[PDB]
Amino acid sequence: HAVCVRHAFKQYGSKKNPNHVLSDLNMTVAKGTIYGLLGASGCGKTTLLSCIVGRRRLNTGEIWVLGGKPGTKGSGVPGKRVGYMPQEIALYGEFSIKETMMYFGWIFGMESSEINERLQFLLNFLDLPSQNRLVKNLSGGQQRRVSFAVALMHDPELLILDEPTVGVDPLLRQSIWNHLVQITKDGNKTVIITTHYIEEARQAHTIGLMRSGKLLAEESPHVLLSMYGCQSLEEVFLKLSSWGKIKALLQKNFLRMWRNVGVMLFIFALPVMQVILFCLAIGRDPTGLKLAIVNHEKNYTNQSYQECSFDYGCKFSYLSCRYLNNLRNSTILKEYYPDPESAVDAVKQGHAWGALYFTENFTDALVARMALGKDADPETLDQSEVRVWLDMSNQQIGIILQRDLQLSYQDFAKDLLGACEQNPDLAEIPISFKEPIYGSNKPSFTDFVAPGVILTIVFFLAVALTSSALIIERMEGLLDRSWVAGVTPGEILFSHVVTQFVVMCGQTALVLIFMILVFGVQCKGDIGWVIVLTILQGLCGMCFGFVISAICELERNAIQLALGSFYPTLLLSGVIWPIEGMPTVLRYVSTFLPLTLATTSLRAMLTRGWSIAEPAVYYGFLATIIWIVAFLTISMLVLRFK
Amino acid sequence: HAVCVRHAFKQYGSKKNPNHVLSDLNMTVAKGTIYGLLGASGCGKTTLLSCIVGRRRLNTGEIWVLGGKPGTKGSGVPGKRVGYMPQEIALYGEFSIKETMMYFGWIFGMESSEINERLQFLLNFLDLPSQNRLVKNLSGGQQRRVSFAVALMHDPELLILDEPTVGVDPLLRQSIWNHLVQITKDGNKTVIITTHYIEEARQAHTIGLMRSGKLLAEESPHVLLSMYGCQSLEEVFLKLSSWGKIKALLQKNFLRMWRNVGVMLFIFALPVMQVILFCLAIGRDPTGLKLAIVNHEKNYTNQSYQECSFDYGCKFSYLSCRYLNNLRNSTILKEYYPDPESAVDAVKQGHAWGALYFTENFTDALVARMALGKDADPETLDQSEVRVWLDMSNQQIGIILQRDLQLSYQDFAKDLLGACEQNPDLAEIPISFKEPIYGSNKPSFTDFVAPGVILTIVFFLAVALTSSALIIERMEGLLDRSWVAGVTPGEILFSHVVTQFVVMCGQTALVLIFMILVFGVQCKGDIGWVIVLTILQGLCGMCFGFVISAICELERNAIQLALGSFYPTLLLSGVIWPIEGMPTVLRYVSTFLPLTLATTSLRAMLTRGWSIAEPAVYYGFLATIIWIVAFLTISMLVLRFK
Numbered sequence A, B: 001h002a003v004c005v006r007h008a009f010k011q012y013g014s015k016k017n018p019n020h021v022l023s024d025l026n027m028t029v030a031k032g033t034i035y036g037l038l039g040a041s042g043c044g045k046t047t048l049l050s051c052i053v054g055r056r057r058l059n060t061g062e063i064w065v066l067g068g069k070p071g072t073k074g075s076g077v078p079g080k081r082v083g084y085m086p087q088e089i090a091l092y093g094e095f096s097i098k099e100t101m102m103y104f105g106w107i108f109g110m111e112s113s114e115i116n117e118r119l120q121f122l123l124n125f126l127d128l129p130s131q132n133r134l135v136k137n138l139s140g141g142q143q144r145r146v147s148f149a150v151a152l153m154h155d156p157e158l159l160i161l162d163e164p165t166v167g168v169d170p171l172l173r174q175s176i177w178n179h180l181v182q183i184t185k186d187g188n189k190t191v192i193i194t195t196h197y198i199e200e201a202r203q204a205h206t207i208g209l210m211r212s213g214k215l216l217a218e219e220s221p222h223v224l225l226s227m228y229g230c231q232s233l234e235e236v237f238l239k240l241s242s243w244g245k246i247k248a249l250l251q252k253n254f255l256r257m258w259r260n261v262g263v264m265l266f267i268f269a270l271p272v273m274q275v276i277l278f279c280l281a282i283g284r285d286p287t288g289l290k291l292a293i294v295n296h297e298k299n300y301t302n303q304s305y306q307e308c309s310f311d312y313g314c315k316f317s318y319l320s321c322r323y324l325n326n327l328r329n330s331t332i333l334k335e336y337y338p339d340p341e342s343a344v345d346a347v348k349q350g351h352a353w354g355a356l357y358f359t360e361n362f363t364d365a366l367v368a369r370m371a372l373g374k375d376a377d378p379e380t381l382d383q384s385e386v387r388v389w390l391d392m393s394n395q396q397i398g399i400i401l402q403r404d405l406q407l408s409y410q411d412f413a414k415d416l417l418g419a420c421e422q423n424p425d426l427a428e429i430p431i432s433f434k435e436p437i438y439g440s441n442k443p444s445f446t447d448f449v450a451p452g453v454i455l456t457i458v459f460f461l462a463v464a465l466t467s468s469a470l471i472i473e474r475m476e477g478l479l480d481r482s483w484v485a486g487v488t489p490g491e492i493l494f495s496h497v498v499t500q501f502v503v504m505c506g507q508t509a510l511v512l513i514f515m516i517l518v519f520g521v522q523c524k525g526d527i528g529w530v531i532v533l534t535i536l537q538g539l540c541g542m543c544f545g546f547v548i549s550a551i552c553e554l555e556r557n558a559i560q561l562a563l564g565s566f567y568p569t570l571l572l573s574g575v576i577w578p579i580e581g582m583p584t585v586l587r588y589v590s591t592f593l594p595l596t597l598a599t600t601s602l603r604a605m606l607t608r609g610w611s612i613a614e615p616a617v618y619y620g621f622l623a624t625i626i627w628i629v630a631f632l633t634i635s636m637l638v639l640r641f642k
């Protein structure tokens, strides 16, 4: 009437050593009775119950329950017509008892006014603590009783229970059995219960004894004892032979993140700290650089004083303190030494980045050098020069020092003339740099790396959240419990995409506000298309999190896969160094990576202000869309023939 | 009397809603009998057994087992005089049955010859599969049977068993109970067993009924039954009121890593390919940049051909193809456009990086400009210049393009002299750079980031490996099982340090071999001192993983703690950018970070060849040692009061 199983096979393990849990099996459960399923091992009964509710799909079998096959649109197994208690405690923490009751009632479509009566009745009957207590703050027995109350709340016509009374007090166990007997009799309710107390299953109506994947007997307990003349059942076994369902899922997802402070800090406060620290340390020009100066045109007094005095008008008095007046104060500090040997010794230590030497004949030789032109003898060309020894072990510092020293002389050369009706253009190399077409004369390395930092934060934090949430929830039977309740797989997936979309929108707003408004990173292009590209890259990472969760079953295995691809793609996507420095063969391969073309597209919009119509901009838009499709296809193809 | 317990109080919960697991409880176990604990809930029995074996301590009470308090002298609890079967399966996977028995027998000091006989007897007795099957490849019942065999193998005088028979067939249950009765037959053996099947405890000599954290009664089963004529125990419970243990651990640790392929890929193959990709993509100079050339001194033919021809001796034929002959071909690609306006349009698209635009009067004006000197009119000063419009949105590209355009003119100017029998020194700016004190004239950025990629890989690979290994083993109960076998915490920590030290030595060798011997990263200092500092940073990360494992209890919490400190310290340790770019306040704070002074010390040795005697070199050695002491102090304090 209620359940009928015929020829049900199932096995686990490899082909060489298979663990046969189920073999040729026959079961018939009458409507309106308590059945009772006793077996030597707890795995076969669990597999049978999971196949009955329709969540395991055993091979080469036949299950008929409440109209037809589970989940076939001819029966009512997935929905409010059955009440399922799993073997594990498939309950959400950080939720009170009343909140759990309300959530599961909203899933089953009960009115909020008729849920309170059931909640109070179950609280009184099952000896439970206050309804405001969090589930994670309860003990194992209390949590199991709360799960039982959840299974009993909606009054189903079929109850499938997996060890409801395992560590319950004998008085409470007796009361529970009396309640089950009462609701079963004089009604249309059927109970299928598996227990370890064989004697306790004496009020049951049709005991089915399970052994070696088959049923040794299935018949009334009293009559079974009558046939063999036994006073206990123990020695008989000794045989030597749908929108409202989306609000509930959406509300639950937002409350789980809000009540986890550590989760809120990792996905919202961690990105802000990286942006703040990156904009304060990476890309700025060094400023604290010390140079050793040996000016032999002036008396030496101290390592911090030189008395650099000269007449600013004309007559070219010193021309060596005049040159040092044009040195940029922001990046270079000046220290003074008495000998070139002692100044060089400072550079050989960590006391200076370079040494400058002026001979006592510098002024006269320099004045004569410009007055002779191409007729200057080698003597005046020797004494009219500044000897510079530099520490070039640091690439960025050496570039700054050389550029500042050279640009300081250009200002010095253009300052000597100009008041004498001489155009400063006489002191220019024929190679003349006009106004830059893009950018300025002082480009910043922070502006080059900033586009890649934004995309990597949004992409890789969507992989971690999606992979962990789906793996954890699937591994403790939380998805399976909701599927039996009548929640379709398309509704669960829809609610996950919406929740992740809102999360990544908050991250995008926070990252862009600090980078642009606070730290002054330039954005020459349209900010509308900058947001769209950032959101699309976040959705690309979410689809990659579907792939990881579809192939991994432990959380420790998922993080290794994520970190195993987070490192190689960072070094090949041109985030910290220009892509033009790579070898040609490696450069071509890198263009097919998920983030390479999008980082280039974002950089052009921020640094050059290019529009969406430029090929270099929309090429990164299309590469993100293709990777989204590829990631979704890979995740589906895992289950296509499996 | 084997066990005596008096007034043992224990609870598990918060002060607001305490969960009193134990209350005033008295328990007495006699020598040579079977004692059965038959509590209603498994929390009290498990806690009592754990307190008896010493792995847990209760708030107030007294425990006396086999001579005294467990864990101290006199008592023989943590040793081979007891046999413990924990509630959960505490066996190592990836190990065969035989290897498990040999490992545990080696722990107990038994000879390899007597372990074989016990293994054969237990395999025959417990109906276990072949001895060569891996533990991870068995079902949930065979694993429990192997755990029971491990408990029984070394023949102890006191057996503490936590549900030895739960899913066992009754046919095997009868044999197991018969074996227990036969071994406990007028001897020194004592068995304490908790079972769900109350009637199976009829063969036990004493029965202890547990309820509400105490014992309702403690008497023989037959005396208890003959109190009012009861014929079963169901109604009775219805009441309303050191050289050889380190070697074994060392061999086990290396075998677990070798038999986990995914573990060796993450810690040995990932760092090698991370170094390879860094040395191929990061730090190199762009070498494919395109420039649009407008040369009106010659006819226009194509975008790839120009017919640049000139004489080499004298007479200054064209001087525009002579300058373009001095351009570096390794980094600049020349494209030709017919008009200056069309060449700028190429730069406004992604087709070029700059424009040159030689004027049709360049040759005549350049020779007149260099033959007049200070008497050059503005007309020849305008026609003799090269007008460069550059794309300056990229900082590193703009440095290369400007540097190469100006150095190619220096060779061009030096070539014009000498061919005219003139001094080449006449084309020198009075700022003359001598031979560098450190480094060369062409510094590399990949030589700046290499000292700091080595340290980052070694440091953070020890945090992840140490934290995961210690957290997983404590949760699964393997650590507690080995403590009751007589393995002190000193040898567990000693064997873990040696295993991590060998792993970090292999990582160091692989990183330095590929970075220096294969990719040619310079090492001007002592290689031996470079090795010492790298290993020192590895041990520093190991001690940081000790703190994380002592604080966290789940692997997902430890990963977020490690990643939450990996991101900030990397951006503040001067790895990818010089430390001189950040503000002074931020630079002061960053010097106290674990990896900041060590990165500076390693860079000095590799790039300058400095010795250990230099203050900039041995500050990184002292900063690393101090952080090791601080990390070992924090972890010890955490375990002291938590």
Ligand SMILES: CCCCCCCCCCC(CCCCCCCCCC)(CO[C@@H]1O[C@H](CO)[C@@H](O[C@H]2O[C@H](CO)[C@@H](O)[C@H](O)[C@H]2O)[C@H](O)[C@H]1O)CO[C@@H]1O[C@H](CO)[C@@H](O[C@H]2O[C@H](CO)[C@@H](O)[C@H](O)[C@H]2O)[C@H](O)[C@H]1O
Binding pocket: A089, A091, A092, A093, A094, A135, A136, A137, A143, A253, A254, A256, A257, A260, A261, A262, A263, A266, A464, A465, A466, A468, A469, A472, A476, A496, A499, A500, A503, A559, B554, B556, B557, B559, B560
């Ligand atoms: C777009 C997708 C929408 C989905 C939105 C929903 C997502 C929420 C997922 C929640 C989640 C995933 C975290 C994912 C990490 C993300 C980064 C990835 C990792 C980086 C690569 C957070 O996980 C929780 O994080 C907490 C952080 O606060 C942590 O708390 C710790 O640190 C705190 C801080 O210091 C500190 O104060 C606190 O003391 C610490 O305990 C919890 O221990 C930890 O479990 C896991 O949920 C957890 O599941 C647990 C049982 O599995 C569940 O345990 C309860 O339930 C059972 C009986 O009912 C039973 O098991 C337990 O007896 C019971 O307790 C927890 O209740 C639940 O929370």
Ligand SMILES: CCCCCCCCCCC(CCCCCCCCCC)(CO[C@@H]1O[C@H](CO)[C@@H](O[C@H]2O[C@H](CO)[C@@H](O)[C@H](O)[C@H]2O)[C@H](O)[C@H]1O)CO[C@@H]1O[C@H](CO)[C@@H](O[C@H]2O[C@H](CO)[C@@H](O)[C@H](O)[C@H]2O)[C@H](O)[C@H]1O
Binding pocket: A554, A556, A557, A559, A560, B089, B090, B091, B092, B093, B094, B135, B136, B143, B253, B256, B257, B260, B261, B262, B263, B266, B464, B465, B468, B469, B472, B476, B496, B499, B500, B559
């Ligand atoms: C300093 C020296 C320390 C000691 C040596 C260190 C290693 C010791 C711990 C080893 C360890 C932690 C590794 C984490 C370290 C790195 C994390 C860093 C994180 C970075 C952020 C690796 O864990 C292994 O990782 C495997 C990866 O290969 C993975 O296998 C997966 O991918 C494979 C690939 O194809 C694929 O074939 C395979 O099918 C996949 O499953 C499994 O999870 C596991 O085998 C955990 O050990 C595991 O413990 C498991 C019980 O929990 C134990 O479970 C087994 O047995 C149980 C019977 O009690 C039974 O109940 C379980 O059902 C059964 O499964 C595993 O057997 C054992 O191995």
Ligand SMILES: CC/C=C\C/C=C/C/C=C\C/C=C/C/C=C/CCCCOC[C@H](COP(=O)(O)OCCN)OC(=O)CCCCCCCCCCCCCCCCC
Binding pocket: A544, A547, A551, A552, A553, A554, A557, A560, A561, A563, A564, A565, A566, A569, A594, A634, B262, B265, B266, B269, B270, B273
């Ligand atoms: C950023 C995006 C970049 C690229 C995107 C994509 C490319 C392709 C798109 C999809 C294809 C693949 C994704 C990855 C999959 C691949 C499939 C198969 C894995 C299935 O994984 C099963 C279990 C987990 O299985 P389990 O948990 O036990 O569940 C039971 C199921 N059997 O993995 C584990 O343990 C492994 C744990 C980490 C293993 C390595 C970590 C780091 C790698 C470093 C090594 C690199 C060097 C290369 C080695 C060669 C040199 C000798």
Ligand SMILES: CC/C=C\C/C=C\C/C=C/C/C=C/C/C=C\CCCCOC[C@H](COP(=O)(O)OCCN)OC(=O)CCCCCCCCCCCCCCCCC
Binding pocket: A262, A265, A266, A269, A270, A273, B544, B547, B551, B552, B553, B554, B557, B560, B561, B563, B564, B565, B566, B569, B594
């Ligand atoms: C290279 C780096 C080296 C050194 C760095 C520097 C200094 C080192 C001094 C180190 C000492 C300690 C650090 C540990 C501190 C303290 C304990 C806490 C957790 C103890 O733990 C509890 C459970 C785990 O507890 P549980 O697993 O449940 O076990 C039960 C035990 N109650 O953690 C969790 O959930 C946390 C999961 C991730 C939380 C955040 C992740 C990323 C942080 C980003 C936020 C940054 C911005 C700050 C926010 C302020 C502005 C609003």
Ligand SMILES: CCCCCCCC/C=C\CCCCCCCC(=O)N[C@@H](CO)[C@H](O)CCCCCCCCCCCCCCC
Binding pocket: A274, A452, A453, A456, A457, A458, A460, A461, A463, A464, A562, A563, A566, A567, A570, A576, B274, B452, B453, B456, B457, B460, B461, B464, B562, B563, B566, B567, B570, B571, B576
């Ligand atoms: C997807 C998995 C990650 C989950 C969480 C992702 C959330 C956001 C990610 C980064 C936030 C953006 C903040 C910096 C990320 C991108 C921006 C940047 O500036 N990146 C550079 C510096 O961070 C770049 O990474 C430099 C690498 C050179 C050194 C390489 C050594 C690598 C060690 C390998 C072994 C250590 C293992 C430790 C634990 C094993």
